[PDB]
Write a protein that binds this ligand. Structure first.
Ligand SMILES: *[C@@H]1O[C@H](CO)[C@@H](O[C@@H]2O[C@H](CO)[C@@H](O[C@@H]3O[C@H](CO)[C@@H](O)[C@H](O)[C@@H]3O)[C@H](O)[C@H]2NC(C)=O)[C@H](O)[C@H]1NC(C)=O
Ligand SMILES: *[C@@H]1O[C@H](CO)[C@@H](O[C@@H]2O[C@H](CO)[C@@H](O[C@@H]3O[C@H](CO)[C@@H](O)[C@H](O)[C@@H]3O)[C@H](O)[C@H]2NC(C)=O)[C@H](O)[C@H]1NC(C)=O
Ligand SMILES: *[C@@H]1O[C@H](CO)[C@@H](O[C@@H]2O[C@H](CO)[C@@H](O)[C@H](O)[C@H]2NC(C)=O)[C@H](O)[C@H]1NC(C)=O
Ligand SMILES: *[C@@H]1O[C@H](CO)[C@@H](O[C@@H]2O[C@H](CO)[C@@H](O)[C@H](O)[C@H]2NC(C)=O)[C@H](O)[C@H]1NC(C)=O
Ligand SMILES: *[C@@H]1O[C@H](CO)[C@@H](O)[C@H](O)[C@H]1NC(C)=O
Ligand SMILES: *[C@@H]1O[C@H](CO)[C@@H](O)[C@H](O)[C@H]1NC(C)=O
Ligand SMILES: *[C@@H]1O[C@H](CO)[C@@H](O)[C@H](O)[C@H]1NC(C)=O
Ligand SMILES: *[C@@H]1O[C@H](CO)[C@@H](O)[C@H](O)[C@H]1NC(C)=O
Lengths: 115, 558, 558
């Protein structure tokens, strides 16, 4: 059994820095990674990045300049960060674990960017 | 200041690095259509995947003084006795004379015993055992590596495991390569680890794989295969590379690569693959960077870049160039024919290509001759001391030895200088007439950790075996590198320690200001009355070559 | 023409020269504010003071076959028996089993005997002795050296004397450093010397000092301390040196020094010391000389020179420079800002400093990598043959050996070619089956002088010990360097002598015109019927590596 839950502000102003934390249980973060996915209103899914068991991380070419991911193995939490938020950043962010390839997905948090 | 000490272990052969050899340089230039230009060579991305794997095995022997061999441990014992309680079953099973046989520890009874950490080992290669007929259970954690094919993975001990590290049943990994029967593999879901050093149990599950080889049992955490990265990687950005055409095949040469590449004269259709965004982008970005660094003020680009597949698996990106002086000749000659486009014009005027072919020919031949001179000297020093040559070739302290005609390499473990102590004497009291050639040392891998015994090596190296012994001499005087400074020993006794700046340095190639003096040999009188050899420093090449000659005479006398 | 022969003695350790080691070159450039310029590095003037000192000591042994040791000679015996008559007292005093004891020569009686010159010794290290229980008196004249502190002086034998060479009572030198009791030192005014070789007595007085160490008595003429010369000396005039700023500390690098210096970014106030007239004058004079040699036509000086104290005791004078092309960019950019003074302007335009930092970065990294390549190769050859490497590094023939991780060095004594003779045979009749590997030689240190026995070494070297023996072989053929030409030996017998120009030379790196032929091995039939090893020339590296392997097998057989 594996589960993931996201926690974020929900509403943020444009041009600020976003911060979302995904709490996960069922597997050790020291060996397996976690992937982040978003979906704006009415569009398909979009891959954001991933953090493997080690400190290495991969980010999308369209968000490498602003995306940044960190984690804490003791708390089994993965921190997501995104600076310089624009208007179109409004989307539902999900954190998807690698216990499998894409076996378990989180509920997701709906984020809106507006002043 | 003080440099860190190093305890280099002996490489087992997991990493073997072959090394280049001399070439047949042409006595006179013969290549056609010579031209200079920028180049970027790409190597096949081997994609090395590293991970840590746990190895389990048992030892069985007979007390009569016979029949000593190794055997693995079953799966149920690893997941129940070792994982749940950190204990090994006393009884062991093996095959003797092609027949099933069993054994027990001291023939006492069927019982269980706990495992204890290894006495010395390494902080990064933790190991455990039940004891420092007789039976012993051993468990060790070693590193593993796999290459792009992912069909096999080599352990730190040098033994290969013919099986894909990603094989399993959780995510349909049955299609992965494997060469062992189904009964020789097992996977556990929801498995919990337990560090035998603390027995604190894991906090979260991690699916564990288990394989039983003919000599030992290997277990590692099953991790899904990461997405595949670009298939090629930049090996080296060549600042200047000459291209020549000969025998229906191009010939690329450089001054830093020290290797000549050959292609089939046809540009590889890089556009045929969608990976151009990874290679075409990185390659072109390097062409302008190198060109703007030194060729923007004296050379001009000739057409668009070119890509060619060379022998050995290399992809060479090219950008032909020509000097401004040569450009003037082409445009001047073109104006005569007219009675701006360098492409489809180069190599056309034979009279203009004749001198450049000879000019660049000497440069290519000069590099080949110089490279052969350095390669033969480098290869000889490599055999004379692979540790120093291997360390400089990689930029970090490294261990290495020659496994015949190939050099095995491994990494060294560093240790602080405050964690090592040098004994006050190098003489052994167990037998007069013999004494260690280097000072003895005692150290600990980490602060507050257990102390280990060893010997001082060369260049702050720490040897775990005290075997450097020699017949002792009179008037002994030697300096040994110890941390930042040096440690002085005389008459096989610790005298004192001195810094690195307390000795004359000859950093420059030639120093004529050495205030030397005519030394007068002073030998103790015991050399004559007792006939005991006198000290002579380390053995010169002729001395070692002359010393073994005496051994032949002694054998003939015997 | 003929080259002079050399009889290199074994160094004792009075002069030890440590030698540089590789560095950690950065993979990519990281230094800031890169700039080229002229530099002059100064070393601390150690001020070596050399003088000759006479050593006296006695030997005592027991005839039963025990208890052999050395002891010094009192002061009254040196100034009365040796100085006035050149004789040594027969009786000797020493400590045996922590008890006072005496001895006599052959237990005859208390008498006196004259000293005789050493049988071989050296023309510059004259020595005398009474005989070539048993007691022997020995007197030797050896060289001594002292450094700037003048607290200790090392003798040619390698033993240090913890006492200032200028200590005395004549000119109030009581304040000089000393570590021996007052009863262990004596000074004589109006002392007259006497050369034991002639016994002609000195012509004028010379105050003599006398010290009694635990092993011998040392005496030397007391000379007043000369006035102190400049505290720093020019170590080397750097033709080109690059300066970089990183980690709050400058970094100087060159192509000839092969060492990187680090400073604290603050110019040393050279004006604070009045020695500027010695360093500031010599330094500035070198800046213009180097600048006018090659930088006057392409570079321009940037401000006044600068001085910095680097780690290790070096004082580096600097004169930053910039090329004319870079000057055009600065003045051109300055004109834009205006909408001549290079100082306080350099490093201001970041866009202009960005490419020069990368450009000069490759040069600095290139030198570091090249230097590491040469240092590791040079150090290996040093261990393989310190005599050749030590001789070229100083510009003159020199003796040297490795005292562990440090190299001891000493000077060699030259001898003319007309004073050496080579024996007609190299076979030893004392025991069949063994013969010298090199020809035997007999020579004299000077014309009409006594003849001495020795062996021919490598590169006209003369060895005083005949020990290079080897199991003999059939079909022997060897060429040995002898003076200008070569001496040919076959079947361990002198054949003839040939000149240096009678053999093909390959001075150039590659020579393809060698008129070689397929040699057909011709072995005498005794190799088969008598099973006696055949000649194989000198041992190749693999042969010596393979020869010792057989020794291990022979030991296992035994
Ligand atoms: C340069 O061109 C030569 C000649 O075309 C290339 O060699 C050829 O390589 C192909 C594979 O790419 C070989 O085909 C294979 O050969 C054997 C039967 O000989 C068999 O395994 C397969 O059925 C297949 O046909 C071909 O034989 C070989 N030709 C020769 C004459 O050696 C070469 O690979 C090219 N080099 C580069 C760097 O592009
Ligand atoms: C570059 O600057 C550093 C930092 O100022 C210099 O190191 C400092 O050197 C002084 C002596 O010049 C040291 O002072 C002495 O230190 C000890 C106590 O630590 C004691 O023997 C004396 O009472 C005296 O205070 C000082 O500690 C030392 N500082 C550090 C941080 O190491 C360095 O010498 C300068 N280098 C050059 C080449 O000019
Ligand atoms: C050197 O390059 C020239 C120019 O490409 C080659 O000459 C051409 O060769 C092709 C066939 O490969 C002919 O169709 C052309 O007519 C030739 N001339 C020109 C002006 O293009 C030449 O073959 C090359 N040299 C070698 C030895 O391959
Ligand atoms: C490179 O040199 C420049 C010029 O000296 C340094 O920039 C100055 O730094 C000082 C403090 O050290 C400031 O007060 C000045 O305002 C800076 N600018 C100028 C134009 O002088 C710069 O710090 C040096 N770089 C490094 C890495 O030390
Ligand atoms: C090449 O040099 C010219 C002339 O100075 C300059 O205009 C141009 O920007 C330079 N190009 C590059 C890529 O450095
Ligand atoms: C000592 O060094 C100086 C330069 O500092 C040089 O001119 C001189 O020749 C050197 N002396 C000897 C004896 O090598
Ligand atoms: C430098 O060159 C100029 C131009 O030729 C000349 O006038 C001047 O004397 C030279 N200076 C030196 C120091 O050589
Ligand atoms: C002999 O030397 C000549 C030049 O004098 C050279 O051209 C020729 O190739 C050489 N011959 C051999 C066989 O190396």
């Amino acid at each position: 059994q594996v589960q993931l839950k996201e926690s974020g502000p929900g509403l943020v102003a444009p041009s600020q820095s976003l911060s979302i934390t995904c709490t996960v249980s069922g597997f050790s973060l020291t060996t397996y990674g976690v992937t982040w996915v978003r979906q704006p209103p009415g569009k398909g899914l979009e891959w954001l990045g991933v953090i493997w068991g080690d400190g290495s991380t991969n980010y999308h070419s369209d968000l490498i300049s602003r995306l940044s991911i960190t984690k804490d193995n003791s708390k089994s939490q993965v921190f997501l960060k995104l600076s310089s938020l624009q208007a179109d950043d409004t989307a539902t962010y999900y954190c998807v674990s690698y216990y499998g390839y894409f076996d378990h997905w989180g509920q997701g948090t709906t984020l809106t960017v507006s002043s | 200041t003080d440099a860190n000490f190093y305890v280099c272990p002996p490489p087992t052969g997991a990493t073997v690095v072959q090394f280049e050899q001399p070439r047949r340089c042409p006595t006179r230039p013969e290549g056609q259509n010579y031209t200079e230009g920028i180049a970027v060579v790409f190597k096949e991305n081997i994609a090395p995947y590293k991970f840590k794997a746990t190895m389990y095995y048992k030892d069985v022997t007979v007390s009569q003084v016979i029949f000593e061999d190794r055997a693995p441990v079953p799966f149920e014992e690893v997941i129940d006795k070792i994982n749940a309680k950190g204990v090994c079953r006393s009884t062991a099973k093996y095959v003797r004379n092609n027949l099933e046989t069993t054994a027990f520890h001291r023939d006492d009874h069927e019982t269980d015993m706990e495992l204890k950490p290894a006495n010395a080992a390494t902080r990064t290669s933790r190991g455990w055992h039940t004891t420092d007929t007789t039976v012993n259970c051993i468990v060790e954690e070693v590193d593993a590596r796999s290459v792009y094919p992912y069909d096999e993975f080599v352990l730190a001990t040098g033994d290969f495991v013919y099986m894909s590290p990603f094989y399993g049943y959780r995510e349909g990994s049955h299609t992965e390569h494997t060469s062992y029967a189904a009964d020789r593999f097992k996977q556990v879901d929801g498995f919990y680890a337990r560090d035998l050093t603390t027995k604190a149990r894991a906090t979260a599950p991690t699916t564990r794989n288990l394989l039983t080889t003919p000599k030992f049992t290997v277990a590692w955490d099953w991790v899904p295969k990461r997405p595949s990265v670009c298939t090629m990687t930049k090996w080296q950005e060549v600042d200047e590379m000459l291209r020549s055409e000969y025998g229906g095949s191009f010939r690329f040469s450089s001054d830093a690569i020290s290797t000549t590449f050959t292609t089939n004269l046809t540009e590889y259709p890089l556009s045929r693959v969608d990976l151009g965004d990874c290679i075409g982008k990185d390659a072109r970005d390097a062409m302008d960077r190198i060109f703007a660094r030194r060729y923007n003020a004296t050379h001009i680009k000739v057409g668009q870049p070119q890509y060619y597949l060379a022998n050995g698996g290399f992809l060479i990106a090219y950008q032909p160039l020509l000097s401004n002086t040569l450009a003037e000749l082409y445009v001047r000659e073109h104006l005569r024919e007219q009675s701006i486009e360098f492409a489809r014009l180069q190599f056309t005027y034979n009279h203009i290509q004749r001198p450049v072919n000879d000019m660049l020919g000497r440069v290519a031949i000069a590099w080949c001759e110089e490279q052969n001179h350095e390669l033969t000297l480098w290869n000889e020093a490599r055999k004379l001391n692979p540790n120093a040559i291997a360390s400089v070739t990689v930029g970090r302290r490294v261990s290495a030895r020659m496994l015949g005609d190939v050099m095995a390499v491994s990494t060294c473990v560093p240790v602080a200088a405050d964690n090592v102590i040098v004994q006050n004497s190098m003489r052994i009291s167990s037998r007069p007439g013999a004494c260690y050639s280097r000072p003895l040392v005692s150290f600990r891998y980490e602060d507050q950790g257990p102390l280990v015994e060893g010997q001082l090596g060369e260049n702050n190296e720490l040897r775990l075996t005290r075997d450097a012994i020699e017949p002792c001499t009179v008037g002994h005087r030697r300096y040994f590198t110890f941390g930042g400074g040096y440690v002085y020993f005389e008459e096989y006794a610790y005298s004192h320690q001195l810094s690195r700046a307390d000795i004359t340095t000859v950093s420059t190639f030639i120093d004529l200001n050495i205030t030397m003096l005519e030394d007068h040999e002073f030998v103790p009188l015991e050399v004559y009355t007792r006939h005991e050899i006198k000290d002579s420093g380390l053995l010169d090449y002729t001395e070692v070559q002359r010393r073994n000659q005496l051994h032949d005479l002694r054998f003939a006398d015997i």
